[PDB]
Design brief:
Chain A: This is Alkyldihydroxyacetonephosphate synthase, peroxisomal. The structure is a homodimer. Chain A is an alpha+beta fold. Chain A has 19 helices and 20 strands. Chain A is globular, with a radius of gyration of 23 Å.
C-alpha cells in the first residue's frame, strides 16, 4: 500500500491506477479487466460492448495508439545549481533528476494531462524529485529553497483533477517536486482520545488497512483512496463516500503541522473545538500547495462498524428521487452513503426509461442498521420508491474503484470523457441537472460532434442546505479537427451553466489552475485579496509556486 | 424582543440582564428573584442564604454601596457630523448611551461599573437599520479617520468591547440592535436570511411562528446576536443536534474598509480555496461589520424530555460522558457537575456518598420514537458506571437554572463576593487531571494572596465531542478586607489560565480572546499562525478603522 519511489513499476505513467489492471477486448469478443485486483478483475462483461456501441455509436474497430512509455528525447533538461546539490547530498535525502520520476510528477488526472502523456509532452516539469521521510527533512528542504531561490511544488498521490501540480510554463527557477510518499507513518494511535497522529504522505488504503489491525478506521473514503494522501485531502478539501457518518476532511482534522518559508504552523493543543480567532486550520485547508508543506495531521478515528448492509431503490423518475433524497436530508437520516443515478447511468450499470436509481449503504450497530433501513424505505415509498434489492446495491459499490479505469479504456477507442462536480441548494438541484446536460448536448452539436454526447448525472452527497452533483460526459471524437479544444470549451461552458444555475465552483475537486478564472467572483474581491495577503506573508518570494487559486 | 435604543429602559446599566429581575431578601428573610420573567422568578429559595453563609463565611449583615448611575466630553469632527445628519441614521452623544456600550460582562468591568469608571468610552453611538446604512458609516469612518467598535448584545466576556485607553481617534459604537430583521425564511432549503442584530430570543420566537427554529441557544440568547455569535465563535446548549455557529452559517455578508466580503453562492459545501467564512468567524470586531447571515433552520422538535443521572463520584461521571461520546449518542444536552455544584444546586431547591457524588443533567429532543430509544441507550451506559436516574424534574431544574446564574453574580457583588466563570476545551485524557489541577490551583493562589475563607472552586463538563470536552470552572470568594480585590481576582484568573494550558486545555472553547487572553494567543496559534492573521488584518483594514485591538 506504500507508494514506491519509482512509481511506474506499479502505476501507469500515462493513465489511471495499477499497471496490472486495465480494460481490454478479450479472446472471445467481450470486454474484460486484467489482473486480480478488484472484484471485477478477470470477469467478462457480456453486454458492455453492445452498450458502448449503442451509446457512443462506434463499433470498436478503431483503436488509437498511445505512447506506452516516456519519450525522453522530448523531456526538457534538468537545471539545478551545483552548490545546492552539494548541500542536498550532505542531508541524505533521496532525490532523482531522472526524466521518469520527473515526468510522473508533472500532472494529475485531468483529461488534458492524460492526453498529453499519451500523445504530446508538457512545456514544463519538475527539475529534481525529493523524498523527505519526516518533518525535519522537509524543514531542511524549505530552508534550502530560501537560500537557493528554488520553487517547490508538493506532491502526494498525484490524483489532482484541477491542474494543481502542473508546472507553470514560464517558471524559470529550479522546480522541486517535493514528493511526500516516503513520509507515511502512523506515528501513533491515541485510543483514549480516538485519534491517530499520522504523517502527510500516507495513502487512504494504507491508513485504513493499518488501523483496521487495531480495530479502527477513519472511514474517510474518497474514490482515490488507493493513492490520495492525508496531506492531499487537507490541501484540496476532499470528501469521502461516508462523510454522512465520519465527516468530510474539515470534520476529520483535529490538528496539523505545516512547514512554510516563514516557519512552522501548528496550534499548541489538541482541544476538540476552540475559540481563539479565525481558525488557521482553515487558512490551510484547500490551500492547494501554495503555502507550504503539510507534514503531520491528527485525525479522528472510530471503532470499525459492527455491521454493514447494502440496498437500492427504484423511482419512477429522477425528479422523485431528488425529492426523496431531500426528504431524507430533511429528516436527517441519511445512511452511510446514498447516491441517486439518472436513467442513462442506470442503463450503464446494467451493462455490467425515465426511471432512476439510488444505491444505499448502511453501517454502525446491527440493531441500528435495521431501524435506519426501515425508515429510509418508508420515506422512499412516499416518492414512488420501491426496494430494488440488497445485491443490486452491492454492484454499484463494488463497481466504484473501476470506473476510473474506463476512461483509459474509452481513450483507446477515440472517446474523451471527464466527470466534474458542483454543490447546489436543494431548490436548484433539478433545474441545474436538466440545464447542464442540455448545455453540453448543445455545445457539442455546435462544435461539429456527430452522435450526441453521453451526458449523465448523480446526486452523490446530501446536506441540510443542498446536494453534491456529479456529471459525466464523453463523446467519440474520430473526425474532429482538434479534439482537445472541443472538449475543453464544452467543459468550460458546462461550468458557466453550473454557476448560472446556482451551483458552486467545486464541491471537492478544488480549484488548482483549471477553475482560477472564476474564483474572484466566487468569493468577493476582498475575499480574494485576503488569501493574497496570506500567500504574501507566508511565502513572500513565492517558493510554493504552482500558482493554484491566485 | 428587540433591544431598545435606550437600553437602560429594559436592562441594568450596572449588571446583567433586565431591570425587573434581581435577587433580594424578602419579607420572610429568604432570597428571591424579583418579577415574573423566569420560572424561578418570584419563587422563594429557602436554603440559599445558608449556603452563601456556609460557603463564603458571611452574614449578609452589610451590603456594599454601588454607584447609582466622570464621563469625558464628546469631541467629534463637524464636517462628519454634518454628513451624518444627512444620512438620517439615528445617533447619540449622550454619556449614558455611550457608557452602556463601553463594556460587556467580565467581572473587572462590572466592578468598574459599580465603583470606578472606564478610562475610555465610545464617543458616539450610531444605529444603522440595514446593510447600506453600515456601508455609509464605514465609508465615513475611513474618510474622517474614525475608529469603529461593533456591538450587538454587549455580552462579551473577553474585553472585546472595551475601548483602548490610548485611542485618541473618535470612537464610534456601531450598535446593530436596530438591524434585526429576518429578511426571509427559505422553507425549501431550510435556511433563514437574517440581519446581524437579531437576538437569539427574537430569532427563535419569530421562526417558531412558522414552525421552525435554529436550536442555537447560548446562555446569553436573550441579548446575544447573530453578529456577535459569528464574531466570537459562539456555542449553544444543543449544538449536539444543531451544530455550533460554524456549522450553522451557510453564507454571510461583511462590510469592511476594503469593501464587501460575500460568497457568490449558497451551496452546502465547497472546495474553493481556504474557507473565508473562517477568516471572519472568530474575528472579534477587528475586520469590519457582519451585516447579514444565512443560518440553517429546522422544524420545531416534536418532543422534549428532561432527565438526570447520579454518579458515585466525578471521575465515574466523566468516564460515562466519554463512553457516551464514544458511541456517539449524546442527547441534545448533557452536563456533568462536580459535587460542589450538586450541593449548590441542592441549596437552591424551591445510598451513595453525598459529599462524593456528581450529577449529570440531560435534555433529549426530537421525534418521540427516537427520544425514547436514545434515552434507554443513555441510562444503560450510565448504569455501567454506577449511574442511576434521579428524575425528570431534577433535570428540568438543572436547565432552567442556567438562565438565572448570571443574576447571582450581581447578588454576590453586593455582599463582597466576586466571582466569575471561565472555560476551556481539552482532549478526553486530560479532563480529570485538568479539573482537579485547576481547582487546586485556584485555592492555593487564594491562600497565598491572603484570602481568609477558601474559595468556591467548582467545575462541570458542558459539551462532549469525539476528541474531547468543554469544561466550565467557577470561582468566587469573600473579599472583605483585601487591599486590592480586583488585582487578586485577575491574578488568580491568570494563574488558573496557566494551569488549564499546562494541563492540556485550549485558550478558550467559546469565550474567545478579545483583550483578556491576548498574551497567550501567539503560543496557542503558531508565531506564523499569528502572523497570518495580522496579514489579513492589515490588508482588509489598512488604516485600522476597526480598532478594538482584540486578538493582535
Amino acid at each position: 500500500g506504500i507508494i514506491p519511489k519509482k512509481r511506474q513499476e506499479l502505476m501507469k505513467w500515462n493513465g489511471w491506477g495499477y499497471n496490472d489492471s486495465k480494460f481490454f477486448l478479450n479472446k472471445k469478443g467481450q470486454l474484460e479487466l486484467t489482473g486480480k485486483r478488484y472484484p471485477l478483475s478477470g470477469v467478462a462483461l457480456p453486454t458492455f460492448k453492445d452498450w458502448i456501441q449503442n451509446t457512443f455509436g462506434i463499433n470498436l474497430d478503431h483503436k488509437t495508439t498511445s505512447k506506452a512509455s516516456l519519450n525522453p528525447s522530448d523531456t526538457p533538461p534538468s537545471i539545478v545549481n551545483e552548490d545546492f546539490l552539494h548541500e542536498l547530498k550532505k542531508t541524505n535525502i533521496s532525490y532523482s533528476q531522472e526524466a521518469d520520476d520527473r515526468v510522473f510528477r508533472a500532472h494529475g488526472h485531468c483529461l488534458h494531462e492524460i492526453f498529453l502523456l499519451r500523445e504530446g509532452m508538457f512545456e514544463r516539469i519538475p527539475d529534481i524529485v525529493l523524498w523527505p521521510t519526516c518533518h525535519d527533512d522537509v524543514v531542511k528542504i524549505v530552508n534550502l529553497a530560501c537560500k537557493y531561490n528554488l520553487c517547490i511544488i508538493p506532491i502526494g498521490g498525484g490524483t489532482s483533477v484541477s491542474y494543481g501540480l502542473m508546472c507553470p510554463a514560464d517558471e524559470t527557477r529550479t522546480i522541486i517536486s517535493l514528493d511526500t510518499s516516503q513520509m507515511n507513518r502512523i506515528l501513533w494511535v491515541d485510543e483514549n482520545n480516538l485519534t491517530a497522529h499520522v504523517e502527510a504522505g500516507i495513502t487512504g488504503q494504507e491508513l485504513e488497512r493499518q488501523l483496521k489491525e487495531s480495530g479502527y478506521c477513519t472511514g474517510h473514503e474518497p474514490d482515490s483512496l488507493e493513492f490520495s494522501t492525508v496531506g492531499g485531502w487537507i490541501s484540496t478539501r476532499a470528501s469521502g463516500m461516508k462523510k454522512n457518518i465520519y465527516g468530510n476532511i474539515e470534520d476529520l482534522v483535529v490538528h496539523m503541522k505545516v512547514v512554510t518559508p516563514r516557519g512552522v504552523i501548528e496550534k499548541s493543543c489538541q482541544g476538540p473545538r476552540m475559540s481563539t480567532g479565525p481558525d488557521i486550520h482553515h487558512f490551510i485547508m484547500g490551500s492547494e500547495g501554495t503555502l507550504g508543506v503539510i507534514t503531520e495531521a491528527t485525525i479522528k478515528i472510530r471503532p470499525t462498524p459492527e455491521y454493514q448492509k447494502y440496498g437500492s431503490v427504484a423511482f419512477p423518475n429522477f425528479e422523485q428521487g431528488v425529492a426523496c433524497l431531500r426528504e431524507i436530508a430533511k429528516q436527517r437520516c441519511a445512511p452511510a452513503s446514498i447516491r441517486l443515478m439518472d436513467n442513462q447511468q442506470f442503463q450503464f450499470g446494467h451493462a455490467l426509461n425515465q426511471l432512476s436509481v439510488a444505491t444505499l449503504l448502511f453501517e454502525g450497530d446491527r440493531e441500528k442498521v435495521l431501524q435506519h433501513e426501515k425508515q429510509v424505505y418508508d420515506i422512499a415509498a412516499k416518492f414512488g420508491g420501491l426496494a430494488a434489492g440488497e445485491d443490486n446495491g452491492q454492484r454499484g459499490y463494488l463497481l466504484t474503484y473501476v470506473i476510473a479505469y474506463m476512461r483509459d479504456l474509452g481513450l483507446e477507442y477515440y472517446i474523451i470523457g471527464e466527470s466534474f462536480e458542483t454543490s447546489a441548494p436543494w431548490d436548484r438541484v433539478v433545474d441545474l441537472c436538466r440545464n447542464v446536460k442540455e448545455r453540453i448536448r448543445r455545445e457539442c452539436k455546435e462544435k461539429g460532434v456527430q452522435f450526441p454526447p453521453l451526458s449523465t448525472c448523480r446526486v452523490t452527497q446530501t446536506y441540510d442546505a443542498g446536494a453534491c452533483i456529479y456529471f459525466y460526459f464523453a463523446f467519440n471524437y474520430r473526425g474532429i479537427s482538434d479534439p482537445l479544444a472541443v472538449f475543453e470549451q464544452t467543459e468550460a461552458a458546462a461550468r458557466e451553466e453550473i454557476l448560472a444555475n446556482g451551483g458552486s465552483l467545486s464541491h471537492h475537486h478544488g480549484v488548482g489552475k483549471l477553475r482560477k478564472q472564476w474564483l474572484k467572483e466566487s468569493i468577493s474581491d476582498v475575499g480574494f485579496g485576503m488569501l493574497k495577503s496570506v500567500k504574501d506573508y507566508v511565502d513572500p518570494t513565492n517558493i510554493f509556486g504552482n500558482r493554484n487559486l491566485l
